[PDB]
């Protein structure tokens, strides 16, 4: 009653059925579940590899097929370039990347707002090839006095002379000229063949940035795959038909690990019925197919007579089975605080599916097929007629709106 007084913004309340704040199934057990997979990945043998060979022969160690701690992948303040787009850092923790691969390259000072698989450089487009899209995040610690060479480094070589534009992450070792005209110089020097790669000048007497930056990058891939791989959260037992913790492989809620008989045909396991939500899951250790379904939710509506006659109130939950929350189950939901009766009357407060309700200290909160009117029957025979003998005069009343207000 206080809730509906708040909703109507008054104290007096008339007779009818009003709606209040809805009821979602708050987690009967908390909002937590993520799959069995728990792997991780090292970086040592790629960060200490003898050769991060030249930009055209960059080295790669297999860092993939693991549950990468995307929180660690963004909570790391050592990450200088984090315009790792498509996804976003501060919510990277809540994510589920199917795979996190391992490619690498070397950055410059002006590109730190441009660095990713997909980045800026003719460096890229001739030692690399794909579009310029942002997804790639760079480890960096203090490298002020580590390793550098006065005069210029002829390995990390800004390829100002490249026949075309900038496109990263492929490989090609041909140190080839600028085709600013029409000259294929086959990787030699000359005039109008200006040596295709100049040196930034990574000098140790120079600043920190010149001294070495061995960069380990990480690719990102999302799949509708068999929902075995996702982030961390406690996985409950396959307690079928009981609303338990589930954030199933990323799909939050609270609900059921119901074993599924669905053969679940073969290439959108994140079952892409047009809603595109997982409807079956298999796991390497639990090979069984596990159905997915969230628990209930629905509005809460309050029925009440006038506030000047009584303070009793009944509550109806819409489209909720009673066991999942006097209790009485109807076709419109679960009704709490009522008395079932068998005699039928007219309708006062319409509920739904042919049920009404009213107040008794006259009728109970009735629930059955309605009464449509008083039954009658006309004595019909093939030689009889009926004729009136008196008349009456009546007066009725009709009301109609004709106009409106006038504003600007």
């Amino acid at each position: 009653l206080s809730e509906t007084k708040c909703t109507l913004k008054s104290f007096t309340v008339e007779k009818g059925i009003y709606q209040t704040s809805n009821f979602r199934v708050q987690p009967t057990e908390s909002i937590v579940r993520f799959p069995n997979i728990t792997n991780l990945c090292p970086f040592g043998e790629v960060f200490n590899a003898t050769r991060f060979a030249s930009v055209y022969a960059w080295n790669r160690k297999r860092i993939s097929n693991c549950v990468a701690d995307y929180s660690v992948l963004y909570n790391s303040a050592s990450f200088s370039t984090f315009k790792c787009y498509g996804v976003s850092p501060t919510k990277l923790n809540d994510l589920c990347f199917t795979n996190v691969y391992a490619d690498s390259f070397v950055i410059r000072g002006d590109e730190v707002r441009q660095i990713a698989p997909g980045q800026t450089g003719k460096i890229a487009d001739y030692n690399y090839k794909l579009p310029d899209d942002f997804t790639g995040c760079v480890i960096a610690w203090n490298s002020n006095n580590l390793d550098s060479k006065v005069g210029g480094n002829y390995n990390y070589l800004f390829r100002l002379f490249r026949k075309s534009n900038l496109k990263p992450f492929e490989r090609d070792i041909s140190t080839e000229i600028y085709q600013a005209g029409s000259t294929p110089c086959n990787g030699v020097e000359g005039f109008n063949c200006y040596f295709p790669l100049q040196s930034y000048g990574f000098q140790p007497t120079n600043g920190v940035g010149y001294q070495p930056y061995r960069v380990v990058v990480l690719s990102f891939e999302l799949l509708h795959a068999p929902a075995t791989v996702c982030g961390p959260k406690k996985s409950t037992n396959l307690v079928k038909n009981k609303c338990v913790n589930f954030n199933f492989n990323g799909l939050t809620g609270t609900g059921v690990l119901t074993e599924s008989n669905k053969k679940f045909l073969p290439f959108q396991q994140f079952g892409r019925d047009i809603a595109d939500t997982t409807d079956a899951v298999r796991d390497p250790q639990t090979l069984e197919i596990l159905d997915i379904t969230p628990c209930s939710f629905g509005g809460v509506s309050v029925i009440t007579p006038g506030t000047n006659t009584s303070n009793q109130v009944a509550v109806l939950y819409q489209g909720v089975n009673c066991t999942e929350v006097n209790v009485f189950q109807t076709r419109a939901g679960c009704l709490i605080g009522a008395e079932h009766v068998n005699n039928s009357y007219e309708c006062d407060i319409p509920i739904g599916a042919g049920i009404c309700a009213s107040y008794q200290t006259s009728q109970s909160i009735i629930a059955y097929t309605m009464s449509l009117g008083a039954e009658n029957s006309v004595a019909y025979s093939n030689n009889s007629i009926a004729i009136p003998t008196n008349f009456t005069i009546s007066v009725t009343t009709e009301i109609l709106p004709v106009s409106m207000t006038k504003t600007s």
Partner: protein, 146 residues
């Protein structure tokens, strides 16, 4: 807001303000147009009712009242109008016995306006909407065939 704010951060808020004013106000100017459509429908109905029921007498069933229409009187109200309808209603019935025709001299006699009714021993002829009996003659019957 205008006193406290800065320009490229106030641009987003003024853009939002026009969008929301024209949006709440766009379901609401769409709603001025929608409610205007509804009010226009009601106004047309009222004009038809006046012309057909106050300036004349109508035969359309259940258009002006319930029963048989006789008259109407209008009144006035704030942003509206009110009608009073005068009708006619039958009261008290009584059973009788009927027949389609009468064969007096081998000929068939049909009523002109009314019905043949019999109180049990004799035959009369009455109008349909009110019970008044009359004797039966060749004034109010016509002949057709055998």
């Amino acid at each position: 807001i205008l006193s406290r704010l800065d320009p490229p951060e106030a641009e987003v808020q003024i853009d939002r303000l026009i969008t929301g004013r024209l949006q709440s106000l766009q379901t609401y100017v769409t709603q001025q147009l929608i409610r205007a459509a509804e009010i226009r429908a009601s106004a047309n109905l009222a004009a038809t009712k006046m012309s057909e029921c106050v300036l004349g007498q109508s035969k359309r069933v259940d258009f002006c009242g319930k029963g048989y229409h006789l008259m109407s009187f209008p009144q006035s109200a704030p942003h509206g109008v009110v009608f009073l309808h005068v009708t006619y209603v039958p009261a008290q019935e009584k059973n009788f016995t009927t027949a389609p025709a009468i064969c007096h001299d081998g000929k068939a006699h049909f009523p002109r306006e009314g019905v043949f009714v019999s109180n049990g021993t004799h035959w009369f002829v009455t109008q349909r909407n009110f019970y008044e009996p009359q004797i039966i003659t060749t004034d109010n019957t016509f002949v057709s065939g055998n």
